[model samples]
Target chain A: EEDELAHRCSSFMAPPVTDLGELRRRPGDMKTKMELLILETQAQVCQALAQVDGGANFSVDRWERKEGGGGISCVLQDGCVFEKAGVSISVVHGNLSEEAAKQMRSRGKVLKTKDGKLPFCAMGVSSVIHPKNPHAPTIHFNYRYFEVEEADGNKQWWFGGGCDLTPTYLNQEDAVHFHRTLKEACDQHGPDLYPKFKKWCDDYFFIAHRGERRGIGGIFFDDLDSPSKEEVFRFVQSCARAVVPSYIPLVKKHCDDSFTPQEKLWQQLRRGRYVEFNLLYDRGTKFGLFTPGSRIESILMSLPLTARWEYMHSPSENSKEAEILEVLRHPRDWVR
Target chain B: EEDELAHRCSSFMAPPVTDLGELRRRPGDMKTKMELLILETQAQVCQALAQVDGGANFSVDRWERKEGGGGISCVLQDGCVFEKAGVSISVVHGNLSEEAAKQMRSRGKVLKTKDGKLPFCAMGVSSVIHPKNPHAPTIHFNYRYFEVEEADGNKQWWFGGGCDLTPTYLNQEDAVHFHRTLKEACDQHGPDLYPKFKKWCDDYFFIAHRGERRGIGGIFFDDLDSPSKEEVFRFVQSCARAVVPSYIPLVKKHCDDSFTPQEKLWQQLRRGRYVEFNLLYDRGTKFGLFTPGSRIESILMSLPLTARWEYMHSPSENSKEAEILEVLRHPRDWVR
Candidate 1:
């Protein structure tokens, strides 16, 4: 029984990216804290999703970077419950280039290194779940912590993340539940954060060319360094945990629902928009692609297994697909 | 008999993008000449593809840009022989932003505008054809004329485009014929042009992370302003005309060719690479997306109808799939 307690992620699909010994060594370090939090989040979420899938368990891949870090990816594809789902956690620490430092500055990082170079540690868990049923919504969530240690002993750290939903057909209650759970998570951390971060989520996921949002907003924030690192980390943990509660019920409710060819086609079309947003607009995607030794599989796992593009695949007036498009064009408040 | 002469592009899918009257009025003008040439090229290529499909004819849409000029889009989806084919011609002119001008500078465009902004006219015909059989190859060709006029009567004119082929399974004869046709077209223009542009095509389509070229190289060149406008236009016309000869026979030979489910799956995986090159790396695609009034349908028509991405999809040793991967990793001189 004492030896049983040594296993950190017993229910997880695979081992954690950070070594077990090093994690034990750095109990007080934020890197250790963030890595453990993301790993646990990835484990719980993958297991919960697999429970729904029943027949299709996620395939886990643990990969290490030659540069200095590693990641764990759990992917379940062609599941009866889900279409393509991925929950990934990465623990990476490495040298930062001077040019890369400028990009970090753009993200509101306060990195003040003497030689324009910096040392950084970044840990995060990100998940994207696409359901089989058209009625069920596609959900995405990410929570990350970043730190840059200065040459003169000063340390700067911050947190970033959000969760959002995309549906082919609009359902009021589903949107409400998703947002309400996210709001509840935020309220425990700060009184007014939900409202501010909700707007930020809406703004960040906007597909400007199409004049639409990626989904109904939840909450998003970056460069979040306030109330101490411990407080922010706890808040991030709350948000990360909130993801399953926010989305799984919707999946369970809609997984077995029947659908027609037309409805399925609509889902495929909506997925095309998802592809556009992730590839063209998402900053996180840009960061993932830019990282050296990053796995293209993990970075591009967000894309649907099969997607299509018709010359002009437009929904008819007042149709279900059109309804969601209207909501996306103008994001609405899901919870007060 | 005279009416037949008036009916230019009689076998075309749709009317030309530029007004017929305007084209007739400026027969001596490069803009007018280019519009007619691209329109005819689009007509010929679409007709050739339609013959292969037999059952599915191209659907035509002539759309105008409220800001300036317009386009004709010809798309055939789910054809018996060809999976998806698009032949499009667009003519557009408008005010150019200083910021936009800066981007054009990166593409080797020269503008000496008195004010920060300039006026520009751009016209092009682009096509991408995907066949149903896995043995058959995918072919893409684009030819265009660009002119930017300064406030002070200075005109910067150039021509750009090329033809390239991507195959799932390697075919030595197919590559030889494809490259030979392109070389013949270039030989008439200049002896060294073929070798120069062949290398350019290979370099231009490199997938850096994957360490592979998109396909057996054909020919690609941009910003060809040397010689005279008429001479360059003729050379472009030759390349545009060569496209049908380079590609159609391969389609004919393989459309009825046999294939297993595994071979088809390999094609889908290869198509995932095609999507990556377009969405992430293709300059023309980037330019099309950036154009203010461009149709998303036409801009995205380069994408295959269906695509799939498998994680770390590796081919086994000495397999047919492995053979193609080897060729892609190390581009060879097909005609030289």
Candidate 2:
């Protein structure tokens, strides 16, 4: 498609129809567009979560990275409905050091530099929600855009992100509902994407040592710059926007469900596994820990309020907990 | 020194004075002696702890590794004194894979391997104690012996271990007492050893991302085969034996002391940091995760039974919790 047609199709790609008509002549910058989208997603998602949490206001903290850029972290703790929840958006850019470049290169990333240093930018919105009711599933979602610029002024970019479900107690209907919503989001962007990204989620969230998936898969994608920047951005926005409809109803369905102390203990145990995966294996967490001037609170807000690790803990042979374990051990086609 | 005289100096290195004349001719093996020492230490420490806890015994679970040896994991939970505690002894041996050998070599380990595999053995006694009272500090101690035998029959050996204290509330006298006892243990081994091992402990237990040490330091030494097998064994024994005396007194002093609910909350938060360090940075935990047929429960026994992670938690300035955080940030010469 022609640039004019692409720009006309989406207001996001077009220059803002602003009071400064001279500045409006220029096209919207991709980086700025991505940052705006992430911030918007953060706000929208946090507002939705707060509404479900009986109007518990999220405490917002804005922080700056020393190297470059900044973030807004919104958290709600000990709420009437939600136990703990966080929604964060960060737009960070800086000169990538030689070590980081090398690491990226080793992972088959095409860096625009030979000596390792490169100008790079990353923007994302990530959220993790833990509800007080054990019957309610925990949920997480993230959508990010990354770019690296070469010496010759050529830019390489990609859109990467996913949403996954981690329920303490198995609810087949809930899983299917969550997956189907994400499927519709992916389907609108491209027919091929839902299956591909769904499988990617399964593979990416695997805890190899424990021989289990992190959760019932949703959709995950990385290094996905094809068609055009506007098209990818549209697809990303769809996934980000799907978060509330995909998860809020499920929370609403179970948030008021009564739960026993035993069930709460089981939820804590599952949260422990979540902690293990994030700390021991999550690539995003690894990046955050090493990133210069990283806002650690925002990075680690994924952890639950409380977690437990019991020695040799095992669910009863035919219990509901074991039923979930079986599904986690071998992921299912939830949408199907 | 003659072999006979060396043997005469210590029962650990001496040949068995057996009823069977044929068996009496053989000297006690270094590997066997190390294994026996670890077991003895496990028993002795558990006995002492149980005595203090009004005979609340540890439930013992023995497990075998698929590839090679096995372990004895003794755990105590919900006791009068300890919330959770574990004492584990594993005598694991197998062929070290090429990847394992390479990792060792990168760390300046000179391994003698035939083909891509080296005959290797690792035996250790490791413990972590989480007392019920927040006023009582948590304690960790580990002593291990490692050996790799070359195709040519030459053997490489070393000793590694340490003990540290993690307190929710700092007590200077307690820190002094703990450090002094470890210093004494090191002093009896060699005059120059205490400072070196103590420094090593501080460095090893550091949480780099958080910019703090795990605890008030003790003594940590690795790759230490210089003085002689018997001598190092003696030193390790001294350190292992010193654990009860160094820590038990402190526990007893605080076990019955009153603690507010706020203090317990602080303890849980501190335990969160402990979980972060072990899962993210502890080498032993890393090794355990990858080792074939590793008992996950025993390896993860270092983790507290319960932990809490609040978003951006910080102790109040000039408060007791703040004092401990300060010391963790800047490790001190407690004995001095």
Candidate 3:
């Protein structure tokens, strides 16, 4: 019964639609397609991750949001290759409160309503991979679609997503490879797309309190509806497809790399920073917490399995750890 | 030179003052008294913890805030009695920006300032003790005094603080003792103080996202300037003094208790919620992050040394862990 409900929710087909207005005419269809795509992305990503782990398998959890929708959370813990990895896809619809909508106005063009409560739907695939080896970098990728129906029955829609790389030990080649892969994917859509989104990623993933970027930037775009919906969807699809090519090779290269206990300690500390950014400033995290019936386990799946916070932790002035801090403080044009 | 600066920052004698206006007239003197109290509290608490640890000594790091003031951070890592413990005192003074003052207005009876920027001083002692034994409950205590100079050169002052307990295993006796001690301290100030502060602690330390209190509650109070500054100051001091008596006995009782690896793992997972509360929702932490020239290390000294986040973690029904969760979800009047 549950599987049938899930299938029916994500299998709706739409008549010919062009803009968000027409899309709202069949909101269920739009929601269904987005949900299906996100679930597919989650499956593909988890399959690739499991292939890399060899000895580890992803644990799949299907959970329902009490108000409207549900999610599939696929997690790999203590994997042979990945210390912790989660690929989650959620499709949820509910009423957006006035305060939440006010905050959302800054992100996109939002239409005002009398009660300031609007029905909305959101679907997304988000993943974070923490490799067991210190030599391998942590990776985070998320792509999402959202629509809010106006009181007049018109609607607004947008796509938002980003991917970034955080390395315990700096490897220029790995950074270059990650960015280049994303660039290629963006270029297939538009030459201007890569640079713009790359800069956006750099700005967005910044840890303001710590005065550093969360990682080597890849690409971030939000409230993106320019050119056309088809073009934006294609770009998002390309980025989604690029994930395996971008991250899998690095994992394969460094999965078996040995490291000193000190290096492992450094990785844990860096993961602490990741924890700081996600909890303190991440917009998606805020939205999840604010939204009713949020499946918190899936939302917090981005956190590392284990993290350490040491008082006044600082690396030696010119050590390898210091080198990563330098790159983080001053993000470089990896592809360039 | 550094020690001299630290001494000048926090240790100074104050002359007799009649009111907050008189106190504001001698801002440095008022600041000095608060600073000295906090520093002394830090020293006293650390001494007690060191005695309890038997083999661990705190490593002190004194740091200066470039804008106006400085702090002393004392931490013990990998101790015999505690895994990680920090006793921190910060005395800072600066001009609170208009935006910041606007935020503050929501918290307490904030007075308007000329130019919408108020000259202010804050002093506090905060500590978090994470014991090596899972049987020993992690403990936290903080007491602070804040003063803001008004446009008329008068001042508004308040005292804020709390102590709470987070235990891996529920112990009704320990909870009773903890709250009873805090209630005694509050009773010394006023008969009404204990219940109000105890309820506030339960409300303030709540992990809203998780639908649980941070732990078993003790007492929390803020904007406590009624009756008189002297009265509230005395109340704050009483709470500060109660810490060693309230917690050290529990530590002495449980520190040597042995547990399985599974219990330790549970402790780490519980610590993860502690981390979430501090980073995501703690008002003091938010204020520290937002304040200019804030000492990040001192502010974050409250975080545990290590924490773990497991995906979709749920305790077994009617188990000890489940019992603790039940109490956390529905806090009770332990002392009553």
Candidate 4:
């Protein structure tokens, strides 16, 4: 208890976990508003998933960082519906000046740096759901807000994240519904935002060596610091909220759908690619690049509980598996 | 079939796969001799394991490259004794310029490059065998020879490789036997070689973030272009030959050793670290750094049949699992 109080000396105590009452009182500030949005989204998504599982509950842990802030990690495993689900919200303030500023800029931030160090805070809610049935597609979403205080008493911030779907078998209707829902969320913000981010999403999820994308693309935008901080915050709030509506119906549809053994094998094989992209090039692996804490468990939770990689396991020609592989090689315009 | 001979138009036709009699006729040439060594090594290791497996035979395939050379891959999966075993011998001729000649030099070759290009041939035998029984440790060995013909008509060559062992449970005698066998091989070459290379092997197999070693310890040497090509070749032959003698006995010892489900689970968790190392920093993932062709199957064959990653699955304190973990953190001197 004493240790908690010692490190809780940062701006306004930076409460150990999301204090809803405290957040509501300070809703006028962008930092407070961003934290409130992600924490609320985290709870809603976890609760909605629990409703679907019918026999599962999320185990929540409030973990603190030594530097400034902490996180709430909600994980549910071996559920009746979801095989493994992780919903985590992390808030931290630390120094990330010695590494690649260009890397940060490319990942959606504009930072002014000095020789010594620049103080910064990053907060986000991220989740990945892998369902029990192979027919049910895997869904992933992460939304974050970054803030850096310059030495000259100026503050800079930006938003970066996306939601995507991966399926063992391609369903045109599901893909269309998923993309249309996300596009509507983008539509509320800007006329052309969805199209631009869709391309970014497709390009971002690519596995270069295999020349395949990780999944059917949805929406990904890294640099969203524009039209005033308030507008950017609203844009991120819309996208973050879109995650549940876009992917939940698909989950419910496939929850009880029967799957053959071969179909399940295909899903395990597909998750191998998911593991490849995340380990090789995802933001989690490059924790030093942006994230304040190198939380291995949370980052690696993106990997399936069990993944399979057979030697030269290429899909059969003209088979259903090959159909999905084809689309991964060449992404489609789902909602255009 | 028609695509076979088109790219075979290089020095000595690079001989699609190793031809023993042909290589015997040209044993005086290091290139021919190198190919003979790796192919023979691959055959012996595969055959030795099959003898232990009792009911399983290796599925062998001879594959060609678009470049000047090719390889033979032998794999046995779900065997009586071994879960998955991959023994591959590859010989290739191509150019590795314009990127990181420094990387090549670091990996153990001293090549003289030109403004346009440099001609190089690389050949190696690599194997990773994961036994079905939890008590039986996993063994991986890769030995390679590289030669570069400079633009100015001179040639440079070097040898680089090592073999290591990974155990699910700590068996001090097994570790001693494995390390002593490798040390004996090194002793025949240099008095100090075993100590230096043992440290090198420990360092090379490290998982930095988790602060653990991939295995106990063995001899690993790079930049072996000293004394003479023949001398270096003989040294590599010693280490490569020690693989079977050092490992096969342990395989037989644990072949029928019954294990609890908990022991098997520990092995699966340890294998998660193996997957992490291979995917994150192993030569297989960095195929472009040295390998001529991006042979995905042969490269990734090092991965286990099924690997699992549990969130924060740390070993129990002061338990059997932690014993191996401690040795991994501080590698022991098995030979000394």
Candidate 5:
């Protein structure tokens, strides 16, 4: 280790992987108190989302942290509403510098390079929720706040995360309502915040190499660095709050009742896109699963129980499904 | 795209996808090169192998590289001697640097902070050949080379390749004979080359995460940066020459007879291992498929027609099948 360089590094090692119940219950307000809050909150939200929507009970699978952090993966299987659904939040902490932080940020980019400034300490909440309804439109919402502290512990943290929607059928009202819900949350923080974060969400959800969005994106923000911890906390909570009403209606519209085998197949195919985004592009998936203390099973729980990799796969041209594919190919302004 | 740093890059624009017959005829130096070489070698090896006591003919199917490259995948179906058979070689090229080269040389241990310094360069190869019959056992042999040149046109090159085996039923005589043939080829070049490359092959085929070897490896060397192009060329030629006799007899022994359905299932399960190795850990697969101009179909020719991925799935215990799994779980000194 000839090139060991130190900044104001955080000495906090990841908590050991023991019982899941213990981590969930302990309220010590530790170093990464907010990330823990997100995990607990998401767990609660999923529990409610499932209870409210039957045939959608969430099962928790845990992965041990090889590098020091493990996470709880709550997934819902073939349900009346959601199929191959996943809602997971992981909190991982390690000693790295600003330079390393940037590379971490560029997890899915074709080429990953280093510009030499590594962050002293890094911690964040990474999660992706894949709902198994093409009509429901799988949505992804992430708001992680990063903090960069100099040697003296004069820490500066930022708030980031937004929501995006992916639908098999383009319901203009649904798309508008989805953005509006998140817009309300962002507007509470500041008018400009929603516009900025909305753009971030749209850009970030993009399947860059494919030139497609993972779905019609909601809002995404990262590297916030706004000095107010309270505001950051409030911003994240509001974003989380935006999910249920924004997405549940769509799920309700498409989740239940009988469908042609072809419809189910279409939903499963869309879930494949979710799988790709999680496995190939998501930073949280890489960081949570690959890093020390990562829970491999939990991290991978986002995957649908069944997936298909058909040869030369794509939806029909000029169809509504293809129209959705087109929107995903080129991101549009949801809130514009 | 004006930036402070001048980063030169290139793409491997393929020679258009055409009929396999035409592709067979294209004197593509790079185009018709690696795939033709691999197919010819694989077909020859399989035919020679089937001439053995219980061998069977292999079936060929096309494989689309999950990432970018593609190849013609050949496999043995329910045949008398062979259970599952495959051989694939992909020719791909991309950027590499002293730093990236060093990282590649390092056995999968790359420190995160120092990424992006992987000096980009082009690398191409003809790789992979796997036999199906347990009696035939299995053999994998790759004869390839790499090149790096200084900006001033001062060029450097090296040769690396080797053949190895995996037997459901271990035959000491077969192992010795295989090694002996390869040794003769290597011994003609230098006093120490065979042992060095033999050890390299043994070491390279090992899977650290699983603490196992892919099979009893033969002579494998990498980055043979031994001062001159002629030296490397001679080295590669020797390895390639060793391929025919070293493996043909074993294939001939296993290819001709009938097998039970149980044996067929075992072959599929074994093919599962091959798939896992290619997808999760193969360096050549990772490097070759990632390059731009890689022909996706020709690059993945080594995969069987079908394989399964059952979560946490493992074969039955104490069965002979377990014996094969056990060796894959631990590296063995076959030559020793």
Candidate 6:
């Protein structure tokens, strides 16, 4: 049962109908075809960001997850201006029993889980990017779709993806730049996409214990299910394409500039908060660490390469850095 | 607020009654005269056990709680009868600011917390004995009390204490003897006291994740507010006095016996569970470790001289040590 759940949940991370074969002319069935496209897309993301930032060099570390799966974790650290940054991608496959599927479904997001006690097959892609520049901020984007079918030929499928950000110093231009870019991408598919995705990002990053949002939000959405796979594929492609324009210029503006020691310190301190949120309160971190095919490094790729923990420290008052800290301390609607 | 809470909390540990003045009391304050008596009694119990089971070759290690208190941790290793053993007394105090108190009170347990804050105090004796003989099982005992008073002139307090036994090789005789000794002490006041304390001991040391009791309980009670201060004090004294007669005999019976290195290894492996419980779920350990006057050595005194953590090891089926391992894995109601 556990195995089935793992398969079903992992299925959501599977790539969509990108017609990537036309882009690459790969030879295989739908499953293998999608997997290759995901790997290609994820690696392209890593390459594009690295080219744009150019300060920190990227390394691809490969290791098998302890629990019967494998993935590569690519990271970069100590850039001239970026500080610490990394983008990681993982692709894995496995068979899960119905009981495990049931377990995963009950957790929160398995909206269409069935109660049968049979095993299933599944696959998917997952990725995240954490940039070292406090001004550039940290952003995460993921998009995938899944299909699960039981032994009796019963089948169900769905799609999910979203993007969000964390910043140490507020730049109204950067914030505006981030949301508007994603909003334009979403509006192309559906007029309602921007608000829905914005709300999704807001709700996703809310931290209850600290009673705050992780940062000024971005766009998030999931489950693009309609009988027509082509529309879903377009949505995924548009979302993925939205990444560079939304964030690249912001990184270029901040990643090459000199930052004050005080600002760097604030960033480091805020990074510490990010670390706590992950280790203590982030479900993604927990699930990634606990999952059967967990690759520790890949799972932890979103964490800054370096962080500081001063005993109970906060940013100073009336500073741009403090303003950024304020937004992180309290989430607000950037688009509005 | 944190500093004021720290300051106010530090002083409240003073025993309410000063009857045990000059008693070389544990470092934390005994707020009331009753607490003074309780500390005095604890001291007597500790000294007697140390003398009967210790020799000139053994030494006492005194450690200060780094945060807000200190403790005397006594251990006898390679003694004539007792192979390795530890007994410690700790006193710690902390302050709760009005806001902190209000926050805590909202969660319940505060009465009239001051507009400024409230002072909190705690005192306790903890001991664990691991005898050398295969026939003699290990044993553990602890007794403690807590008091809270808000700056708003509202005060609430309670008394609690208990003893339990964990034997490697179940000697029914020793088990019965241990409980009978404690039962007699409780019987001095009321027949119900033994059962109440026994149940309390069983309930207190439970491992919730494993759903098991720590061991065959002896006698335990806490927050005994209804019994009047003097009555609770005398009952606690009786429980303390019961220690020497009940445990020293077992130490004498098992400590001098010869054992192979394998036997010692087995003993250490068992001790690992003790360490696991302390670090993972023991509230006392957590509180002591985090409290301002935390004495690391005293707090860690309960640890066996050695332990083991095999990657994936479990006791063998029908192994001589299986009984103890079973109890560690699956707790049982001893007194019940």
Best-fitting candidate, scored by TM-score: 1
Candidate 5 docking band: incorrect
CA RMSD, predictions in order: 3.7, 6.1, 5.9, 6.0, 11.8, 15.0
User: Tens-digit lDDT track for model 5 on B1-336?
Assistant: 642111110111122222445554555433344333444555555555445425455454544443333444444543444433444444433445444555444544332222342322232333344544445656666655444434553444444556777664445677788888888887877878878877776676565545666666677666565645556566665666567788777666665546687775565545444443433344132343322111233324444433322233465787666666675665444443
Arranged by DockQ with the best first, the candidates are 3, 1, 4, 2, 5, 6
- lDDT by residue (B1-336, candidate 6, tens digit) is 555323432433233222233333543433544344444544555555566654523354545544556555555665544555666656556664455455445545546645545577667666766665655667766666666775555566666666677665556678778888888888889888777667666676665545655566677665477666567766777777677788878766766667787776665545554444443344132344222222334434555444442222455888756666565555444332
List model 4 lDDT by residue over A64-141, tens digit each.
Answer: 857547887888887899878988888776776455455666666666764457677788888889887888889988
What are the runs in model 5 whose C-alpha is more than 4 Å off? A1-36, A52-125, A129-149, A165-177, A257-299, A310-316, B1-123, B126-144, B148-154, B160-220, B226-326, B332-336
lDDT per residue, candidate 3, A13-88, as tens digits? 2111123354445555756556556666777788788778886777777777576476677789987888899887
Per-candidate DockQ vs. reference: 0.41, 0.38, 0.42, 0.40, 0.07, 0.03
- For B112-169, candidate 3 gives per-residue lDDT tens digits of 6856578887778778899989989999888888888887868888777888888888
Runs off by more than 4 Å, candidate 6: A1-33, A53-56, A61-67, A105-128, A283-299, A310-317, B1-336
Candidate with more favorable, higher lDDT: 4 or 6: 4
- Candidate 5 local Cα displacement, residue B22, angstroms: 20
Query: How high is the CA lDDT of each candidate model?
Result: 0.80, 0.77, 0.76, 0.77, 0.53, 0.58
Tens-digit per-residue lDDT, A108-171, candidate 6: 5352334444333333445555555556677766666556654455555555666666777778
Lowest lDDT 10-residue stretch of candidate 5 chain B: B4-13
lDDT of model 1, residue A68: 47
Tell me which of candidates 5 and 6 scores higher on DockQ: 5
Task: Please report the candidate that would top lDDT against the real structure.
Answer: 1
Scored against the true structure, residue B310 in model 6 reaches a CA lDDT of: 26
lDDT, candidate 5, A1-336, per-residue tens: 332111111111222223435544653423344655455456555755676567656666656575555555566666665555566555455545344455556753221222332233234444445555555666655545444443443554455555677675677888888888888888988889888876776676665556777777777666554646776777787777677778777666666545577766666556555544533344232343222222333434444444433233466787777787788877666664
Better of 1 and 3 by TM-score: 1
lDDT of 1 by residue, A1-336 (tens): 544325656756677777788877778888887877888889889878878887677788899987747888888887787778998887778767666677767766666784556778887887888887888889888888878778688887778888889887889999999999999999998888899999998888787888999788788887788989999999999999898999999998988889999888777777777776644544232355222112344447687776766555677898877888899998889898
Name the candidate, 2 or 3, with the larger DockQ value: 3
- Per-model B-chain TM-score: 0.92, 0.86, 0.85, 0.87, 0.61, 0.72
CAPRI-style docking class of model 1 based on DockQ: acceptable
> Which window of 10 residues has the lowest lDDT sum in candidate 4 chain B?
B4-13
Between prediction 1 and prediction 6, the one with superior DockQ is 1
